[PDB]
Amino acid sequence: SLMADQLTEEQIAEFKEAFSLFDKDGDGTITTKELGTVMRSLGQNPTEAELQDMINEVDADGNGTIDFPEFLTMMARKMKDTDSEEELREAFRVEDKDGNGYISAAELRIVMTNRGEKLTDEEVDEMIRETDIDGDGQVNYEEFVQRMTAK
Ligand SMILES: [Ca+2]
Ligand SMILES: [Ca+2]
Numbered sequence: 001s002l003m004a005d006q007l008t009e010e011q012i013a014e015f016k017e018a019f020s021l022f023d024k025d026g027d028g029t030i031t032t033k034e035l036g037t038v039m040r041s042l043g044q045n046p047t048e049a050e051l052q053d054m055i056n057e058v059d060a061d062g063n064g065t066i067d068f069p070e071f072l073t074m075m076a077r078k079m080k081d082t083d084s085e086e087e088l089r090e091a092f093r094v095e096d097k098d099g100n101g102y103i104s105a106a107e108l109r110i111v112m113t114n115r116g117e118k119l120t121d122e123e124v125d126e127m128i129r130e131t132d133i134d135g136d137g138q139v140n141y142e143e144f145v146q147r148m149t150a151k
């Protein structure tokens with residue numbers, strides 16, 4: 001865990017602020033139900049099993065609960081709500097082989113061959129319009145994100 005190292009005391013101060021209002025019972029350590037309360041306020045509904053794993057990854061002391069050093073590791077990994085967005089940003093690169101920041105019909109052809117999902121020169125040009133709104137034949141992060149949100 002190198003998280004406190006990548007931050008300043010200015011930010012670590014803000015993290016003990018973010019720890020104190022997070023810890024409802026006021027014991028100075030965040031349990032599964034306490035995780036479950038504050039994360040549920042952000043539009044999430046996690047089970048005791050999930051919050052347990054959120055602990056087990058960051059729990060270098062192995063007690064079954066979060067302390068301040070564990071939190072600088074934990075909340076940093078949660079600061080990306082649906083962090084799989086970065087995985088689809090990676091998918092945007094694999095789709096953009098020429099690596100210019102927008103997808104074309106011939107670009108969907110050359111990625112679908114590697115995916116094992118080979119689509120016709122027509123079929124790929126259809127996907128361009130299924131995700132992109134403006135009809136330029138080009139798919140950038142703004143219009144691309146539509147198909148990733150639709151699923
Ligand atoms: Ca507590
Ligand atoms: Ca712990």
Ligand SMILES: [Ca+2]
Nearest residue numbers: 096098100102
């Ligand atoms: Ca491209």
Ligand SMILES: [Ca+2]
Nearest residue numbers: 132134136138
């Ligand atoms: Ca477009």
